[PDB]
Ligand binder design. Structure first.
Ligand SMILES: CC1(C)O[C@@H]2[C@H](O1)[C@@H](Cn1cc(CCCCC[C@@H]3SC[C@@H]4NC(=O)N[C@@H]43)nn1)O[C@H]2n1cnc2c(N)ncnc21
Ligand SMILES: CC1(C)O[C@@H]2[C@H](O1)[C@@H](Cn1cc(CCCCC[C@@H]3SC[C@@H]4NC(=O)N[C@@H]43)nn1)O[C@H]2n1cnc2c(N)ncnc21
Lengths: 322, 322
């Protein structure tokens, strides 16, 4: 109902204590019996709320659905982010962010449980299953020249990798410049875009898709052999909210480093986290394709590639298959 | 009415011949007497339409108002532009374009007779009086790296300058990298922004404001001594549509050169059109300000400045006062 979110928010705010129907009823100035029905509704949706006579209700576990009410709590207590928008289903969080950023200087993120028209790089299809991953776009407002986009994209990589890492028992790796892998599985794709002019960046929009809970069974058959979810490498249930909390924390951390450090400072780390070394890489550039090795990431984020013909290239970007 | 535009369009399409009320009435399948009223309306709005018994109506001269109906004709017959949007008044054509470009690959422009929140560079106020200038934003779709924005901005300068030139008896000059002057008067401001990522440009949005018909009397008093309209340097009435036609033609011309030439090819021309030479220039950069001379524009669009302290700078952009 009109108050589902408000109740949820109250439940979350009051953890680890119980609050009474009465008490919520007074908060929202609605009837006790309306609260009982809104709670029955949340339980039905898959909220695990323990209800005890006299004591009240304790939110124990949220389902794999994003609730604005709860996310409102993450923006309230955050320094970086002014607000968020949360959807059950949308064409793409990236389109939404590009639209919402116009005309303001807010920093915000957009979450949606599903995307019907999720796109990655080169307008390639990104699979966004209802309930199974974090499909998000982050808009930030770094006061910097437009050529700093590349640098943004390297720092953020490590933010995302650290967040996924905390939750997988297996080894998590960055595939420069835009993917996160767990062994052979792509567990995350991200894409950093900007609105900018000669004088600087108007906004960074970083779209980030991370598979949380798919079983291989759930991945379209063409991608199954190279995809993975965070769940498939975690012994415990993966809690999307718990993960979202770590992710925002690392995004913020790397954003501050982005703002205050040159790339050289994280280069080694980025290196030791990358999974593109000692192996043949396939490169696409328009029509052409060629094989190559990654020799090094220079102090400026460019990949140094020695191609199959023996020639060296220094690239700011590429699409690499393995 | 519902059909104002349709009638206007028909009037325009049929020039230099007359068409009858009857004939329009059949085109739109509406009544003759409705046509007579829609025509009376257009006349009232300031359309100069000659009406002769038996013969019909001839559109002779449009007022200083943009009509979608007529602009629809400019996009129909154009190779570059998929559509346009036309408004009487809007916050900013630039905000509108940034919003309309999301989710498609259309090329289009937006015209509005007035802007209530017109912005230039650094979010500085741009004065957009109803009826007095061309306030436009152009969205194009060049398939190129994001660093090519600067180059875009130089080519387009010359497009705009050539279009204004054709109409002023006086000498029209580019003030690198974003202004067009007639002697001491800023006659146009433009601003080239982009949506882009590491892989390239998603869209160029070029906002372009050109003063057409202000008398000095009409300019807010702070800018009066350094502003000007195209009218104030044209012996003939300045026809906004006639000008819009030249402007689109030159935008297209320079866009094709942008796509196919390096900067070196237009450099000399850009040079001989620039008005920043042999004079002291004031530069702002964040907090700092300093004086300097423009020595040269290198083959890559960067300004070579020797500052007042004798030091050389190579800049991709700057804000210069005189
Ligand atoms: C043949 C292969 C290897 O299989 C596909 C495809 O090639 C490749 C195409 N591509 C371009 C990019 C760049 C990163 C995109 C970020 C998406 C986020 S979601 C929130 C935000 N909203 C939005 O619209 N976009 C962002 N990544 N992938 O990915 C694989 N692929 C597609 N879906 C998935 C998936 N769910 N999991 C793993 N791999 C996938
Ligand atoms: C003190 C001084 C010198 O007086 C002001 C101010 O400093 C300076 C501030 N600025 C930043 C930029 C960059 C170019 C802007 C392009 C506008 C187009 S309109 C269609 C599109 N929609 C949109 O929102 N923007 C674009 N130019 N000027 O301009 C002067 N100024 C303001 N208005 C005018 C004017 N009408 N005519 C001449 N000078 C003006």
């Amino acid at each position: 109902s009109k108050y589902s979110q408000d109740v949820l928010q109250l439940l979350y705010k009051n953890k680890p204590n119980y609050i009474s129907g009465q008490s919520i009823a007074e908060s929202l100035n609605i009837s006790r019996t309306a609260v009982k029905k809104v709670i029955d509704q949340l339980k039905l949706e898959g909220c695990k709320i323990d209800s005890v006579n006299h004591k009240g209700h304790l939110l124990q576990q949220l389902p794999d659905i994003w609730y604005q009410g709860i996310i409102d709590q993450y923006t309230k207590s955050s320094a970086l982010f002014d607000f968020s928008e949360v959807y059950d289903s949308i064409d793409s969080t990236q389109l939404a962010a590009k639209k919402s950023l116009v005309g303001n200087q807010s920093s915000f993120f957009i979450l949606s449980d599903e995307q019907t028209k999720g796109r990655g790089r080169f307008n390639r299809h990104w699979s966004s299953s209802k309930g199974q991953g974090l499909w998000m776009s982050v808009v930030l407002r770094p006061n910097v020249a437009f050529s700093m986009i590349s640098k943004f994209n390297l720092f953020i990589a490590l933010g995302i990798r650290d967040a996924i890492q905390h939750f997988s028992q297996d080894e998590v790796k960055v595939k420069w410049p835009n993917d996160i892998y767990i062994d052979n599985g792509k567990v995350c794709g991200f894409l950093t875009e900007m609105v900018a002019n000669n004088d600087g960046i108007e906004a960074i929009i970083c779209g980030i898709g991370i598979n949380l809970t798919q079983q291989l069974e759930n991945f379209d058959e063409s991608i199954r052999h190279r995809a993975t979810s965070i769940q498939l490498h975690d012994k415990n249930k993966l809690d999307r909210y718990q993960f979202l909390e770590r992710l925002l924390q690392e995004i913020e951390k790397r954003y501050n480093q982005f703002l205050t450090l040159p790339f050289s400072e994280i280069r080694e780390e980025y290196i030791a986290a990358s999974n593109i070394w000692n192996r043949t890489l396939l490169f696409t550039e328009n029509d052409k394709q060629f094989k190559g090795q990654a020799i090094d990431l220079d102090y400026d984020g460019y990949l140094i590639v020695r191609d199959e013909a023996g020639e060296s290239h220094r690239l700011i970007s590429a699409d690499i298959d393995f």
